[PDB]
Amino acid sequence: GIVEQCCTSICSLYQLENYCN
Amino acid sequence: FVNQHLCGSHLVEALYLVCGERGFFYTPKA
């Protein structure tokens, strides 16, 4: 999930926007 | 500010800035 993608690994704008409504 | 390790409040802050008026969902256990 987002913690695995952005916290334990390096985040990206691409991935953050996946969680916008 | 998005291209780094973002944890906890730092991650929620990034979602907030990126998603703007669309808002977002934060689901750390999914």
Curated annotation (Swiss-Prot), chain A:
Disulfide bonds: 6-11
Lineage, broadest ranks: Eukaryota, Metazoa, Chordata, Craniata, Vertebrata
Name of protein: Insulin A chain
